[PDB]
Amino acid sequence: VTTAHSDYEIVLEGGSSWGKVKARAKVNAPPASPLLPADCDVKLNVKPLDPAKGFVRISAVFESIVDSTKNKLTIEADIANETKERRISVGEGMVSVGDFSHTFSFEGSVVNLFYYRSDAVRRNVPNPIYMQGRQFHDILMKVPLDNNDLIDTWEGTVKAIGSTGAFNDWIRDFWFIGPAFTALNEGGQRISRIEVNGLNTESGPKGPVGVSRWRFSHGGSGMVDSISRWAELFPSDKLNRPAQVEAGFRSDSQGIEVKVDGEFPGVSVDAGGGLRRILNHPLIPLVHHGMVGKFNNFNVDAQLKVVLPKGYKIRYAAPQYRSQNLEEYRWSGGAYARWVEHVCKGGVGQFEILYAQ
Amino acid sequence: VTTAHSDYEIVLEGGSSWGKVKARAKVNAPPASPLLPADCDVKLNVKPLDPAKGFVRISAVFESIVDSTKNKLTIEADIANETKERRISVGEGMVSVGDFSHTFSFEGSVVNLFYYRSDAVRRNVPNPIYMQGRQFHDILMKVPLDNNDLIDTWEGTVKAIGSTGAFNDWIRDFWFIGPAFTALNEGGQRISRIEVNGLNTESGPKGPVGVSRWRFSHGGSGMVDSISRWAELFPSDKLNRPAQVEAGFRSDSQGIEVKVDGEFPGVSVDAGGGLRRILNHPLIPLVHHGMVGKFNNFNVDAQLKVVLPKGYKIRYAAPQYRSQNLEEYRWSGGAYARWVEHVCKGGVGQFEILYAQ
Amino acid sequence: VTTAHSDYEIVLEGGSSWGKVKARAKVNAPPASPLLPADCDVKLNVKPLDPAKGFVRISAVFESIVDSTKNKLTIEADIANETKERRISVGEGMVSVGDFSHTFSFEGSVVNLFYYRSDAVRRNVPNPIYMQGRQFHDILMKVPLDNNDLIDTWEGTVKAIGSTGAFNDWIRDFWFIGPAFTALNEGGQRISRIEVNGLNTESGPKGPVGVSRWRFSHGGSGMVDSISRWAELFPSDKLNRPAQVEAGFRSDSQGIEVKVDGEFPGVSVDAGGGLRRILNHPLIPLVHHGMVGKFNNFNVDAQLKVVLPKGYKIRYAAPQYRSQNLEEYRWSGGAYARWVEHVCKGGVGQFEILYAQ
């Protein structure tokens, strides 16, 4: 029988939206990857840089093995809000695949805009979900052309841009490789044609550098969390100490195994009336994973454990928890099991938890 | 276990395409709504107004409660065919959400056009399904700007239209909220950019009125019933007395419960050769519901009852009925059960019923 | 219970990428066709014409019965590669539906272009799958206007082209009938507006002929095999004798039954290191069938038999085979059964088989 075994745990901090999240999962069904096996490890870290100007330093490392090819991507960036709609970033990183690698540095800004703002909606809807909007990226990137492969790609690109009028359109076929293209529509997401503002070869300290300045916008009909939850997804103001997440998966023709461990702020939020809630589930991950969650029938063997800070209690949970031991609450079987099956297949049915002192 | 229990009943009138439809359904699986609970009641009524000019008066009321917010929409309209391709309407209604509400009045015409008409298809295909075409809307609407929220929205819009060249394009991200966007492609449906022909503030008897005149077209590759079955979906010529439908659902994290009761013309149609059929199932509802029907495994406990007028008998049914008692025919289990599972998940496999005297 | 019973067999030739493929399948679940019943037979044949210029002659016959309407399409074409990116074709055929039929002749070229070519990818990825690109069609077609239906359609079209500026856009709604439209996005595929280069009525030996010259391009994000595997899908260089495939299905409200039998080159390919593999599974068929494979729950009763040439053995298989008798290997149950369920529902998880002497 195909069985998914999972275990999730959330330990909340008092007052502080911080939480520790742990997850383990294993399913004996094949992944929908046309190249197997595929293993990946991810490590994310962020630390307060300069709280006066709202800067944080984020670092990410992705490492994987796909059909015997070793890949790696690292990125380090400094990010800050300038206004409520405009955020800026500056960073550098590296990509490496087998014997090949290249570096890059960049600076960019993103402006997030909602299509409407209405007090009539605001005062009448206590927990608004869909927020339609558009987000603008303005990027400057630099890559040292220090090997023949880079030179070839740079020259090929400069040739294409200057010869093909549809380049700004067709580039999207290249960018959203494989089923990434398909996922755009699934999430109510649109990518505009790009605008190329400048392409130059500079003379760097150590050699020629390919410099490019370009922009694009991305629209969302309300499920794109990047747009609808712009402020909430970057809780820089609550980052009083370093946060981190380590996650990884191993997969082949027999099954998938995953592990996650992290601690960061933003896990709980003020729900008003003196109540707090675990944050609303982001929609994108459920909709995108929904594209791969329907290929094998499975049974669910799942459990969730929520540990509240001392003296806090759950005022409302639906689905309902099965047991409680002081501050620890557990869910398993029954309606919780049906909800897990549901979300693993792509459903976004609400699972709400409100707690208070 | 997840079980869907449903009961459907159709009682046909003799000769007259009229029928009474009753449906009850309950499933213990969560709905895919990111806000729960969600309850809704709908009431539709239509009555012959002036049969000489083909006018009917339709009225609709929608009432719901979503996460504790009460919403309501009413609409009343007079509709008539002018030609076989052009239909006109004039009406008014109201929207209300919590402490907020606004009214509106409108007049509009819709022109439905098929991309081709061929006698070679017509004489060779007895029961044609896909009909590709395009439909044009021309709308004039008026809303009294009688509160600050309306004024804010009106001024914001007039500002956007005059400052953003992409407004006619991006408005579509706002219009098709959440997963409504996604459903467009799923049904082979396209919405053009809008055309804004006029935006004015008039001086009404009781205050300023925001007046707008705009158009859009919508294409369909053949599954869009609004286009392919343009004439059949508005049987004004068979409406010799008032028709109505009452329907509603209650839903939360535990399950969904639905009830429908109606009586209206258009349930049966001439199939030629002296035969009649229950109308072909519209495709849109199956394809759209198919987007939410695949998140939980279920067992089917379903029954269908068809009551023919006295002296009529079923000449062909596939799937086959299980039993017959005079004019009453029943379906349950076996192939019918597999067909129900199929359509609830998004399939459009044909279920045909032909009857005759 | 819904059960799918299938049997697949591959017999490989030694050295030669030739293989014989046999498949039988039956499932008692209804097809997603809004018109039933639907039966179809297909016959394909190809033979070396002139190996010096790389020409092959291909012939196809499609015959079906849909809801009692008999349809038939035949096509015969001569095809050759001119370069590695450009292929040319010349042919003729016929379409017939009930009492109607028409012929056609044509000549066209297709140019396939990849968006990038990189040695860094080539040397580091041993078995590349996604290849983004665009394909250009240039078509000249001729149809004798020998009946009133043809004349009507021709005149209607010439009228539309000259009156509607959006014809080159809207024609796509007509072309991708029903759910064919939807399938485009699902496979990461895009069709451009068409370009009409010429529309003329010529005076043929036997009467007026409608002549048209038009083009279109089609983009693919990497799953479109027509683009990413352009060379491999037309193994003209391995066609040393005639190849053929016969296939057909019967279907109605009770189930689907299918049979396939063929022999052709391209079934196995050099995998490097002295190893050979069965070719990578094309992605389109799995993704498109995935749109209809999820409407009924089923159990799998499936078996695969692979017969290698004398003296060859399997060096790697995942999922693993169950048994081996000399050169014959069999798969059934366990991980193979889960893989079948997976691909029948739309998954593309890799099933790899490497063999060698």
Ligand code: BCL
């Ligand atoms: C049988 C039903 C099964 C099931 C079947 C499958 C199948 C089948 C698959 C998965 C896959 C996965 N499943 Mg599942 N899965 C089940 C239940 C679970 C459970 C659980 C029970 O709790 C968990 C935790 C998981 C977890 C996972 C992940 C390990 C994995 C998806 C990886 C991912 O996020 O990539 C997200 C990837 C991306 C975002 C990459 C995008 C790249 C493109 C080009 C886009 C660029 C983005 C943008 C430009 C970059 C942003 C720029 C800004 C700077 C940010 N599944 C159920 C029970 N699962 C998939 C997988 O990969 O397995 C190895 C997969 O194929």
Ligand code: BCL
């Ligand atoms: C450039 C990227 C953006 C950004 C984009 C997003 C987006 C987009 C989302 C979040 C979400 C969240 N972010 Mg943010 N976020 C950024 C910086 C931060 C910082 C910080 C101070 O720098 C913090 C503390 C957080 C914290 C948070 C939480 C409030 C929330 C996740 C809650 C949860 O329970 O997850 C539980 C944690 C897990 C289940 C494990 C996740 C572990 C894996 C390793 C990470 C995901 C990998 C992703 C699928 C693959 C990346 C592919 C790209 C090609 C690289 N973000 C930067 C500025 N963030 C999510 C949310 O809910 O928003 C409201 C969300 O949708």
Ligand code: BCL
């Ligand atoms: C486990 C599998 C389950 C299942 C799982 C689900 C799930 C999961 C969900 C449903 C949902 C629903 N299911 Mg189901 N369901 C099952 C079987 C059934 C059976 C049955 C057995 O007979 C029935 C009768 C139902 C009935 C229903 C409905 C009560 C409900 C869809 C509401 C709707 O139509 O909104 C249609 C809504 C719209 C058309 C709104 C569109 C708004 C957008 C912005 C578009 C504008 C349109 C346009 C501009 C206006 C027109 C202008 C012209 C003037 C006309 N289901 C199977 C057995 N069902 C959904 C729901 O809402 O539940 C509460 C849902 O999430």
Ligand code: BCL
């Ligand atoms: C402005 C809207 C259009 C219109 C648009 C449509 C569309 C679109 C369709 C129909 C369909 C039908 N219409 Mg019509 N229809 C109109 C006016 C009428 C009038 C009349 C004289 O005024 C009559 C008698 C009918 C009668 C009929 C039937 C012939 C047929 C439904 C058969 C059935 O078995 O349903 C069985 C009944 C049910 C299963 C219960 C339905 C109950 C719920 C309350 C109604 C649906 C709500 C919808 C999902 C949500 C609306 C969301 C919008 C945002 C408001 N229509 C007006 C002019 N009609 C359908 C059909 O089959 O076409 C051939 C269809 O697809």
Ligand code: BCL
């Ligand atoms: C319950 C789950 C079931 C299941 C449920 C279904 C359902 C439901 C359906 C099918 C359908 C089919 N299934 Mg299945 N199926 C199952 C398992 C199987 C197994 C097996 C176990 O091995 C097999 C062999 C099959 C085989 C098949 C086929 C007989 C059939 C798809 C026909 C096709 O290819 O049309 C491909 C068709 C096209 C490509 C036509 C495209 C026309 C459009 C307009 C596009 C034009 C293309 C282009 C312009 C022309 C090219 C130009 C160049 C010159 C080339 N299924 C699983 C177990 N199957 C479907 C069917 O048709 O059944 C009769 C269907 O509805």
Ligand code: BCL
């Ligand atoms: C105009 C069409 C193109 C073409 C387009 C494609 C496409 C597209 C694909 C192939 C694929 C393959 N082609 Mg090629 N192919 C052409 C000419 C040929 C010639 C030849 C010398 O003329 C040969 C020998 C082949 C041989 C091959 C194999 C290498 C490979 C199938 C392997 C397999 O196991 O299938 C197993 C066989 C079966 C499972 C049975 C199939 C039987 C049915 C009758 C055929 C499919 C019908 C299709 C679904 C419906 C057609 C609808 C259209 C509207 C007409 N092609 C011409 C030039 N070929 C596939 C592949 O894997 O590419 C790498 C693939 O995706």
